[PDB]
A paper describes a structure:
Diphtheria toxin (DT) is secreted by Corynebacterium and causes disease in humans by inhibiting protein synthesis. DT consists of three domains—receptor (R-), translocation (T-), and catalytic (C-)—and similar to many other A-B toxins it enters the cell via the endosomal pathway. After the binding of the R-domain to the EGFR-like receptor on the cell surface, the toxin is endocytosed into the cell, and acidification inside the endosome promotes the requisite conformational change and membrane insertion of the T-domain followed by the translocation of the C-domain into the cytosol. Following translocation, the C-domain is proteolyzed from the R and T domains and proceeds to inhibit the EF2 translation factor, leading to the termination of protein synthesis and cell death.
DT was crystallized under varying buffer conditions in an effort to determine if conformational changes, particularly in the T-domain, are observed with a decreasing pH. Overall, all of the structures are very similar, with RMSD deviations between the Cα atoms of 0.34 Å (997 residues, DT-5.5), 0.38 Å (999 residues, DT-6.0), and 0.41 Å (1000 residues, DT-7.0). Interestingly, the residues between H223 to P234, which span TH2, appear to become more flexible at a lower pH. In the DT-5.0 structure, the TH2 helix could be modelled in subunit A but not subunit B. It should be noted that this region does not form any crystal contacts that would cause conformational artifacts. Surprisingly, the TH1 helix maintains its conformation in the crystal of the full-length toxin even at pH 5. We demonstrate that neither catalytic nor receptor-binding domains change their structure upon this acidification, while the T-domain undergoes a conformational change that results in the unfolding of TH2–3 helices.
Author numbering:
A (entry chain B): 4 to 37, 47 to 187, 200 to 222, 225 to 227, 229 to 347, 354 to 516, 521 to 537
B (entry chain A): 5 to 38, 48 to 187, 200 to 347, 351 to 516, 522 to 537
Write the structure that this text describes.
Amino acid sequence: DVVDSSKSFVMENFSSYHGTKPGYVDSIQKGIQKDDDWEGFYSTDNKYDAAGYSVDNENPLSGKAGGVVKVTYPGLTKVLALKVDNAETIKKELGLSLTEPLMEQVGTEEFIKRFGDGASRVVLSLPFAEGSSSVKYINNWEQAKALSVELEINFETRGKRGQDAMYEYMAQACASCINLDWDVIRDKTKTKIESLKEPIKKMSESPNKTVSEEKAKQYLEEFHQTALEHPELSELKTVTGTNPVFAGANYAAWAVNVAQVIDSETADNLEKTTAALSILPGIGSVMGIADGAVHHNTEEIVAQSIALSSLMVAQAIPLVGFAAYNFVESIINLFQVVHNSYNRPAYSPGHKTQPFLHDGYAVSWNTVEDSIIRTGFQGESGHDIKITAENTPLPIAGVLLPTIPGKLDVNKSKTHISVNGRKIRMRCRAIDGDVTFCRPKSPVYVGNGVHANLHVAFHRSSSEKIHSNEISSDSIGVLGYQKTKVNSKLSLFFEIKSMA
Amino acid sequence: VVDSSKSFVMENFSSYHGTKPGYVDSIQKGIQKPDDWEGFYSTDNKYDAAGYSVDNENPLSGKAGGVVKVTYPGLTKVLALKVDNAETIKKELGLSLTEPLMEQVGTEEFIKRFGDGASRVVLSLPFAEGSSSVKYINNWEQAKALSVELEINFETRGKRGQDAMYEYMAQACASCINLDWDVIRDKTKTKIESLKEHGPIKNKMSESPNKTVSEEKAKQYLEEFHQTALEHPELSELKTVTGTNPVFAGANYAAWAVNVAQVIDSETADNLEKTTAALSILPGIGSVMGIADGAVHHNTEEIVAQSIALSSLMVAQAIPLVVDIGFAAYNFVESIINLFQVVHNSYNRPAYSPGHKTQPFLHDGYAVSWNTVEDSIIRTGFQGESGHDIKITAENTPLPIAGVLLPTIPGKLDVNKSKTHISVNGRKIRMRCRAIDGDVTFCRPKSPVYVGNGVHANLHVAFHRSSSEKIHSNEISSDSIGVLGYQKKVNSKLSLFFEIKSMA
């Protein structure tokens, strides 16, 4: 079966959102007008995802954003949700002429009778994207003539620089949320860059000619140290002083790498500058993004880091106008891209099937259901964790498992770990009443070409549902190699759910 | 709920059972018992049975017993199950949900309804994730009927350590690492004695503090010791084969040797089980083993004994600096030899490589994988479309994805440019796809893609087939989809390996 009934419905005045490119925002309000199987007018239930289609098609990296409009059908509309996007399959399980195109057939009187449940027309619904809870709607172009069109937002009307209007709109979705005023950041960035070209005048001690990569980097680390003494970078100096990602040597690497890929054709064209900078490593140094967090999350500190790296790029071009102009506009856009990724709902490492990457290991739950410990029944469950490592053989010392005195137990007979198919039994001992430690009975190593499947088996004695009160941890702790001695900790996060 | 494809009736059905030391002869006089799954266990694979043969009180370093072959007279039904939850099994097999599943399997009622005319039923389950073997679960009463022959007694081989067991398991592969550990043990002793008599060796042993020093000074000193020791004629191959791969550098031998000395106390040093347990949780053993980048590089007896001999000497030098040094040549060698055999056995076993099936590809801080096994298969022999999902993230700071290299076959297989896209934490990003040649298409995201801790992408590749003609090997150059990371001028290459399969 191909139609998801749980997601299909009829509704009066069905509304959705369409991301509109610049120059079409006014025109589209006068009516919706024009694979072939999927030729239709596209919309979404989520106005923020709509805004992602609004950017200039000739300059998708750096161009202006048009707007979003809300389209509405009068009367009754059937939303038919599909469990697949393979049309050949669809037409098969829906008995249609496998010759005629799907979105053509979708708009016919015959289709709307069979599937419309008495609505005036059908709209197809599909998952918008992997990792998204939004949907996309596919409208037959002729039926789409029935839509009235309202402006939800015109980004150019805001009259803001770059893509700030679009990204500021999207930050609305999250009310943690990076909601920065980029106007302020552009202004503070300008003033700090000029307030610093005025000790910083180590421009004398600079070769001012081509030199060697190691030489340029060396001099740029010194320049970075001197720059950070300036009081207009004082907070930056404080917040970048420990984390090795934010060290002057990484600012220097970044700046050097910018200098080598930016030629004159590139620097005069913002789209081309952004494409060039977008494929470099190291931007996390400038952005203050490390270990899953956006540390530079204030307008002032972002302006400092941008201001500092603008200066270093300036210094770095002679050794290997653009710095304060197109370099800043481009970097700002990439900041906005990454901040938006971190604002969107997303499973963190070790949750669901997202891998946990640490100390050279990669661990993950094998399937989503593996990461759920079901409750409310007596009996058994099994849960599979995949484990490998990037290069040389790294040991697995054991695993820490949650236990509930009397209501949840490790099944020490079915709990085991298998290394490239070799089944290894475990010896499990309670640490206390809430934690059991299981170690392999022979040595477990993983590495390139050597993986393991840890199979965790649980036994429930009570039909009683588990209460959060009862469980201390929310993760299974896999122990890596020993390195004050401690094991590398690899965390698989689970969720307690009722059977269903 | 029953896997008919894996179920069958067979005459003289046999299987293998690994047997602990002390039970190799007595088990042959009959299968006797010493709750849903209480039964006698066996496998179709005699080398996995060998895996169950090690002394239960010294599982890391203890002796291995043997394997016996058990056979049922007459007709046996192998009933293969698709799940291992007993409750699920009794329900869906409309049978008693009070009596233990395995006690029921030996009753006449069950044997009539599921035996297909055989005298007894044996349950069949997958042996383990990553294995093509099965385990058999035999009812204890019915197992009384089993005839038991000896397949191997590892003790009767009279070899040191667990050499006999691992040499047996190496047969399964006829690449295959099949080392003569007797030779290696002998060459190792010889080199250690021959290196202990060398002029510049002993000369560098005098420059030693021979006193507890700091860690860093122990490493500096052990690094010098390593360099000096490598000039000796008996380590000459090691000097050549360790000269360039930084994993095999003197500084990693020295960090290993220091880690050994720091965790080996006096009680540990005198017990092999406890030394193996301690040594088995250290990082860096790939340095001594010559294992890196998915390959066992030290794969000759001579080079393996050179690395172990050198490592033994360095541990001897590290013990005073950071509690008798006789550990270095007794239990340290015996223990490390066991760890070698464990890892060699892992590499000898069939296994999908990184980027094959759903095995992650880890490179340059990135992790990429096919989302599902079917994603990794480009099906052929039909006109139409397919979709393939690739997961992408990175370990810490934001790393870019510049594009993907996709295969094409002029006139038969093409990239569906409208369905191919990438999504970043749910943000959908269209791609611009251009052909490089008639065999390779490059697609770039239309907005910047970064991944890192907490930011993952889903690359969705869509193919369209214009012919129903099956794709021929002579048509596809590559066997991988090439995901390009950051630019260093060359891109970080992340490979996802696919297989071409007709339809099912």
